[PDB]
Design a protein around this motif. Structure first.
Motif, PDB file in Angstrom:
ATOM      1  N   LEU E  17      30.985  -5.443  62.705  1.00 47.58           N
ATOM      2  CA  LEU E  17      29.824  -5.088  62.429  1.00 47.58           C
ATOM      3  C   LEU E  17      30.080  -4.115  61.148  1.00 47.58           C
ATOM      4  N   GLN E  18      31.056  -3.040  61.512  1.00 47.66           N
ATOM      5  CA  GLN E  18      31.363  -1.906  60.525  1.00 47.66           C
ATOM      6  C   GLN E  18      31.940  -2.610  59.104  1.00 47.66           C
ATOM      7  N   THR E  19      32.564  -3.619  59.147  1.00 47.49           N
ATOM      8  CA  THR E  19      32.978  -4.349  57.938  1.00 47.49           C
ATOM      9  C   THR E  19      31.867  -5.073  57.157  1.00 47.49           C
ATOM     10  N   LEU E  20      30.911  -5.613  57.909  1.00 49.21           N
ATOM     11  CA  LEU E  20      29.759  -6.367  57.488  1.00 49.21           C
ATOM     12  C   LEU E  20      28.929  -5.604  56.920  1.00 49.21           C
ATOM     13  N   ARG E  21      28.555  -4.359  57.474  1.00 52.60           N
ATOM     14  CA  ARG E  21      27.570  -3.098  56.992  1.00 52.60           C
ATOM     15  C   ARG E  21      28.513  -2.637  55.663  1.00 52.60           C
ATOM     16  N   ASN E  22      29.522  -2.436  55.583  1.00 48.59           N
ATOM     17  CA  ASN E  22      30.399  -2.050  54.298  1.00 48.59           C
ATOM     18  C   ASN E  22      30.242  -2.908  53.295  1.00 48.59           C
ATOM     19  N   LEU E  23      30.238  -4.170  53.368  1.00 49.21           N
ATOM     20  CA  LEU E  23      30.231  -5.488  52.236  1.00 49.21           C
ATOM     21  C   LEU E  23      28.781  -5.188  51.396  1.00 49.21           C
ATOM     22  N   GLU E  24      27.795  -4.907  52.220  1.00 52.56           N
ATOM     23  CA  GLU E  24      26.307  -4.763  51.540  1.00 52.56           C
ATOM     24  C   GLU E  24      26.291  -3.471  50.783  1.00 52.56           C
ATOM     25  N   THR E  25      26.609  -2.370  51.279  1.00 48.43           N
ATOM     26  CA  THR E  25      26.804  -0.890  50.613  1.00 48.43           C
ATOM     27  C   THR E  25      27.767  -0.820  49.473  1.00 48.43           C
ATOM     28  N   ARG E  26      29.201  -1.133  49.675  1.00 48.89           N
ATOM     29  CA  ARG E  26      30.123  -0.846  48.739  1.00 48.89           C
ATOM     30  C   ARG E  26      30.053  -1.895  47.569  1.00 48.89           C
ATOM     31  N   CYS E  27      30.837  -1.066  46.371  1.00 44.98           N
ATOM     32  CA  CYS E  27      30.727  -1.949  45.090  1.00 44.98           C
ATOM     33  C   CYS E  27      31.793  -3.097  45.327  1.00 44.98           C
ATOM     34  N   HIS E  28      31.376  -4.105  44.443  1.00 44.27           N
ATOM     35  CA  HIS E  28      32.417  -5.368  44.377  1.00 44.27           C
ATOM     36  C   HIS E  28      32.758  -5.597  43.100  1.00 44.27           C
ATOM     37  N   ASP E  29      34.162  -5.738  43.025  1.00 47.26           N
ATOM     38  CA  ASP E  29      34.900  -6.149  41.625  1.00 47.26           C
ATOM     39  C   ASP E  29      35.218  -7.630  41.472  1.00 47.26           C
ATOM     40  N   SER E  30      35.026  -8.190  40.227  1.00 46.69           N
ATOM     41  CA  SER E  30      34.875  -9.487  39.774  1.00 46.69           C
ATOM     42  C   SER E  30      35.644  -9.350  38.504  1.00 46.69           C
ATOM     43  N   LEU E  31      36.603 -10.182  38.356  1.00 50.12           N
ATOM     44  CA  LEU E  31      37.268 -10.551  36.858  1.00 50.12           C
ATOM     45  C   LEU E  31      36.365 -11.285  36.079  1.00 50.12           C
ATOM     46  N   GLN E  32      36.241 -10.656  34.687  1.00 58.38           N
ATOM     47  CA  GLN E  32      35.640 -11.335  33.521  1.00 58.38           C
ATOM     48  C   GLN E  32      36.595 -11.612  32.354  1.00 58.38           C
ATOM     49  N   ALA E  33      36.149 -12.691  31.653  1.00 58.52           N
ATOM     50  CA  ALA E  33      36.940 -12.932  30.471  1.00 58.52           C
ATOM     51  C   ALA E  33      36.215 -12.441  29.223  1.00 58.52           C
ATOM     52  N   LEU E  34      36.680 -12.084  28.127  1.00 55.43           N
ATOM     53  CA  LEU E  34      36.121 -11.604  26.922  1.00 55.43           C
ATOM     54  C   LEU E  34      36.839 -12.187  25.613  1.00 55.43           C
ATOM     55  N   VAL E  35      36.159 -13.085  24.891  1.00 54.31           N
ATOM     56  CA  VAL E  35      36.740 -13.576  23.602  1.00 54.31           C
ATOM     57  C   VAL E  35      36.307 -13.052  22.439  1.00 54.31           C
ATOM     58  N   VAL E  36      37.238 -12.840  21.514  1.00 59.16           N
ATOM     59  CA  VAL E  36      37.044 -12.039  20.170  1.00 59.16           C
ATOM     60  C   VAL E  36      37.787 -13.017  19.327  1.00 59.16           C
ATOM     61  N   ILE E  37      37.107 -13.518  18.175  1.00 55.58           N
ATOM     62  CA  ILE E  37      37.818 -14.459  17.384  1.00 55.58           C
ATOM     63  C   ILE E  37      37.874 -13.557  15.749  1.00 55.58           C
ATOM     64  N   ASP E  38      39.059 -13.527  15.722  1.00 60.30           N
ATOM     65  CA  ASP E  38      39.649 -12.828  14.322  1.00 60.30           C
ATOM     66  C   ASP E  38      39.463 -13.790  13.031  1.00 60.30           C
ATOM     67  N   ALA E  39      38.261 -13.655  12.494  1.00 64.21           N
ATOM     68  CA  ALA E  39      38.255 -14.288  11.163  1.00 64.21           C
ATOM     69  C   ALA E  39      38.444 -13.508  10.039  1.00 64.21           C
ATOM     70  N   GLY E  40      39.270 -14.052   9.232  1.00 67.35           N
ATOM     71  CA  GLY E  40      40.084 -13.248   8.060  1.00 67.35           C
ATOM     72  C   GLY E  40      40.121 -14.057   6.849  1.00 67.35           C
ATOM     73  N   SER E  41      40.697 -13.423   5.702  1.00 70.58           N
ATOM     74  CA  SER E  41      40.964 -14.157   4.415  1.00 70.58           C
ATOM     75  C   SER E  41      41.577 -15.269   4.338  1.00 70.58           C
ATOM     76  N   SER E  42      42.959 -14.970   5.225  1.00 69.57           N
ATOM     77  CA  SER E  42      44.074 -15.816   5.376  1.00 69.57           C
ATOM     78  C   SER E  42      43.829 -17.033   6.493  1.00 69.57           C
ATOM     79  N   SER E  43      43.502 -16.378   7.855  1.00 73.59           N
ATOM     80  CA  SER E  43      43.275 -17.287   8.916  1.00 73.59           C
ATOM     81  C   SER E  43      42.088 -16.878  10.077  1.00 73.59           C
TER      82      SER E  43
END
Lengths: 285, 51, 238, 44, 43
Positions: E17-43
């Motif tokens: 129950l202690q582990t279950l009660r902690n999951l509701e209150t504690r912060c969760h870490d999730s991996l996210q991807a970010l895309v940046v397109i480098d558009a220039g004069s050459s490429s």
């Protein structure tokens, strides 16, 4: 001729960009599903709702209050009171009602309470999906699944507190069952201690007042006079509620319930000071 | 002389029965929001006052 | 004869002045669960059929008891101990809506039998006149279920598990309306509804706590966006 | 390239990381556009 | 014996129950991807 061909071709190309530029700036409407589980002394049943979400740039996503519409109310399954009562008969003995039983000794039968709650939750998940698959069309399901379905399981007046730990721990197990659903249907059901929580008779009466005034188009942002709201007298199965002139001298022993201060209505909506009373002794049973 | 008062900070995560209420200093406008939130068991008894 | 199927169970389970208030209402906490709800020196209940006597008893026991139950003051409750004190000190002219399955059926049964007029005014004496004739009805054993024979040939209907206790709810409606009229302020109108119709003509949702629970989370634009959209289903993911 | 705490660089030099941060650092605005609206915004 | 069996069984149920009660209150870490397109004069 050549002038009519050129002018129309430019116009089609111009209107193409105008439509594309509008999609980026204008707000987008998406259909979302809302689940409310009515857990009582007699039965535990699901209620599936539909709402329109407004996605505006830099503003975020918000549900249109007037768009909230119920689609279908689920079948009456066994109440949460019976779920724990059967758990007390098998793991503590039938004498539990009169003979004193230690609560600390029952802490070893926790996964057994999880299995009992799992049996009811699977039936409630089956009933909800059956409503969603039969009431929504294919384009509606794309919007409904992608957003995620919030679940609001509330145990109303009638379910006893038990005066120990049983009911509190059961709710922790119920939330875990909702947050971990079957990935087969695709409907992302989820909850938190704010949404899934036990409710009292007085709280139930206040929500019944907000329901009545919303449906009657009385509750809104624009004030008419403090907004002109109509009172309600709800005499339910377990408890009866009475929730409903201006600036009257009220006694010190009795407090006028303000829905804005008690975090039931926002500051933008007009102030509502109501007389909220709930009596178990007047409820049908 | 007239009445006796007993005010003290409430136990962290108490039972709190619906018969009684916890008095929050910030919610009762006695203390500002910048100061830490405090819930107290504030009671006054006329029968326990010296006179 | 079951302890769980007994209607006095929620009162027996819950039962400084709380111990004294329960004992005076015949629910002794010191006594065992078996004889706590068991009626002392009683074996058979006989129906006398009197609405005025039923109203006075509903008033003295349920509506306005001289020694009422604790009725505690929580964050949601006002603090009033009973119905009689609500309309005495906090009466309002605001419109009223009377809801409840057994409550709505009390008015419908009188309407269908022609005793109560088609126009739902909400007058206490008009409701009491119709209920006085209906509750003073005879019961005879028939071939296809027991029938409720109304006096002076007014009509008849089948007796079931929801029709026999309907007259007690009729007395509750009369007693509750009597306290509303007795108060300083009287409501704009008294109406009975099962569901409220929208702009299309059909109701969007049923009456109860259901829509209120949705709104109290939904209306808070910032908080709803943080829990239902920012965190969402992606929160519970390893 | 600038080395991190592990010894190896997290990202290359240029405008790339600056563009991410200037949207990311604004907690409220980032939550409204990337999480509240998200991919669900462009949906018919 | 019986005391060691009961005390451990309660502890497993309590920590569940202690582990279950902690999951509701504690912060969760999730991996996210970010895309940046480098558009220039050459490429």
């Amino acid at each position: 001729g050549v002038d009519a061909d050129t002018e129309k071709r430019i116009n089609v190309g111009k209107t193409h960009l105008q439509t594309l530029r509008n999609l980026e700036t204008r707000c987008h409407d998406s259909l979302q599903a809302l689940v409310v589980i009515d857990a009582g002394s007699s039965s535990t049943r699901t209620n599936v709702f539909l709402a329109k979400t407004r996605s505006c740039p830099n503003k975020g996503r918000s549900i249109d209050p007037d768009s909230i519409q119920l689609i279908r109310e689920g079948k009456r399954f066994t109440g949460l009171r019976v779920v724990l009562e059967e758990w007390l008969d098998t793991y503590a003995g039938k004498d539990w009602e009169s003979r004193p039983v230690d609560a600390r000794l029952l802490f070893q039968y926790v996964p057994q309470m999880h299995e009992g709650a799992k049996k009811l939750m699977q039936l409630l998940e089956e009933d909800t999906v059956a409503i969603l698959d039969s009431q929504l069309n294919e384009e509606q399901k794309v919007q409904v699944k992608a957003l995620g379905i919030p679940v609001m399981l509330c145990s109303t007046a009638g379910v006893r507190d038990f005066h120990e730990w049983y009911r509190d721990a059961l709710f922790v197990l119920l939330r875990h069952l909702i947050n971990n659903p079957s990935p087969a249907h695709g409907y992302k059901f989820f909850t938190n201690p704010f949404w899934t929580r036990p409710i009292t008779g007085a709280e139930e009466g206040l929500f019944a007042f907000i329901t009545l005034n919303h449906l009657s188009r009385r509750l809104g942002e624009d004030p008419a006079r403090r907004n002109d709201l109509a009172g309600v007298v709800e005499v339910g199965g377990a408890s009866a509620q009475i929730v409903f002139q201006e600036g009257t001298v009220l006694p010190s022993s009795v407090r006028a319930v303000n829905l804005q201060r008690e975090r039931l209505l926002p500051e933008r909506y007009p102030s509502a000071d109501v007389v909220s009373v709930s009596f178990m002794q007047l409820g049908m049973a | 002389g007239a009445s006796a008062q007993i005010v003290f900070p409430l136990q962290e995560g108490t039972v709190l029965p619906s018969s009684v209420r916890a008095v929050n200093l910030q919610r009762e406008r006695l203390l500002p929001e910048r100061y830490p939130s405090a819930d107290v068991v504030s009671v006054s008894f006329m029968q326990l006052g010296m006179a | 004869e079951d302890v769980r199927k007994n209607r006095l169970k929620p009162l027996a389970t819950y039962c400084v002045t709380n111990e004294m208030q329960c004992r005076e209402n015949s629910i002794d906490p010191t006594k065992p669960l078996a004889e706590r709800m068991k009626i002392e020196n009683c074996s058979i209940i006989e129906g006398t059929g009197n609405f005025d006597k039923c109203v006075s008893q509903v008033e003295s026991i349920l509506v306005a008891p001289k020694l009422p139950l604790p009725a505690n003051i929580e964050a949601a409750s006002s603090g009033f101990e009973s119905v009689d004190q609500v309309f005495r000190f906090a009466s309002s002219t605001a419109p009223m809506f009377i809801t409840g399955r057994e409550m709505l059926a009390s008015i419908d049964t009188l309407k269908d039998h022609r005793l109560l007029r088609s126009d739902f005014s909400g007058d206490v004496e008009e409701l009491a006149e119709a209920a006085r004739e209906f509750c003073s009805s005879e019961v005879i054993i028939r071939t296809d279920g027991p029938v409720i024979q109304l006096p002076n040939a007014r009509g008849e209907q089948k007796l079931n598990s929801l029709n026999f206790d309907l007259c007690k709810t009729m007395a509750l409606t009369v007693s509750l309306l009597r306290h509303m009229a007795a108060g300083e302020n009287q409501p704009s109108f008294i109406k009975w509804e099962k569901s409220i119709a929208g702009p299309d003509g059909k109701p969007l949702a049923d009456l109860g706590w259901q829509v209120g629970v949705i709104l109290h989370h939904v209306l808070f634009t910032e908080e709803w966006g943080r829990t239902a959209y920012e965190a969402g289903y992606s929160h519970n993911l390893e």
